[PDB]
Swiss-Prot record, chain A:
The normal, monomeric form, PRPN(C), has a mainly alpha-helical structure. Misfolding of this form produces a disease-associated, protease-resistant form, PRPN (Sc), accompanied by a large increase of the beta-sheet content and formation of amyloid fibrils. These fibrils consist of a cross-beta spine, formed by a steric zipper of superposed beta-strands. Disease mutations may favor intermolecular contacts via short beta strands, and may thereby trigger oligomerization. Contains an N-terminal region composed of octamer repeats. At low copper concentrations, the sidechains of His residues from three or four repeats contribute to the binding of a single copper ion. Alternatively, a copper ion can be bound by interaction with the sidechain and backbone amide nitrogen of a single His residue. The observed copper binding stoichiometry suggests that two repeat regions cooperate to stabilize the binding of a single copper ion. At higher copper concentrations, each octamer can bind one copper ion by interactions with the His sidechain and Gly backbone atoms. It is found in: Cell membrane; Golgi apparatus. Glycans are attached at N56, N71. This is Major prion protein. It comes from the Eukaryota. Changing F72S: In GSD; atypical form with neurofibrillary tangles.
Length: 102, 100
């Protein structure tokens, strides 16, 4: 299966229990993508499988792309997964709406 | 102490970039709490202070509670579950508070 790239979306504001992470994310959220890769909606899609795949592929592709670099720390990996998951849910909402209203 | 305990919510399926954590969560999610503690709404309430208060109290309350038996993996899973459920709780309360 290939994957579509969604349109940019605004980067999620995310609040963390760790004061360090909470501030780090505010100051560094521009380091992460504002688009996700996803499998187009079909008869087999649901939020669980859509987001599962979107998260896996978006992170994997970003690593493949960022081997113009790029020095993601452990903290960046954690920040990256949280933001990607939220954006993938937003993408699911976009695609599923378009797919049923059609 | 001024905090409420929310009603049970369905446990979210939370996704991780790495295969190990992603599967671990599917297999173990039923072991984490499905209620969070929070400060009820207000003219001062927004996602920001609501979520931060919910996370701080709820993590706390599980320091007192659990302890039974949890690895660093479970602790990381639980922290993330709380951070995500607190957003869900915010959506529930902010909306109820506004439709009244």
């Amino acid at each position: 299966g290939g994957y579509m790239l969604g349109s940019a979306m605004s980067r999620p504001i995310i609040h963390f229990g760790s004061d360090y992470e909470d501030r780090y994310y505010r100051e560094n959220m521009h380091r992460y993508p504002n688009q996700v890769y996803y499998r187009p909606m079909d008869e087999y899609s649901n939020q669980n499988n859509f987001v599962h795949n979107c998260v896996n592929i978006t992170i994997k592709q970003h690593t493949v792309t960022t081997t113009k670099g790029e020095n993601f720390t452990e903290t960046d990996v954690k920040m990256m997964e949280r933001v990607v998951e939220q954006m993938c849910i937003t993408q699911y909402e976009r695609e599923s709406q378009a797919y049923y209203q059609r």
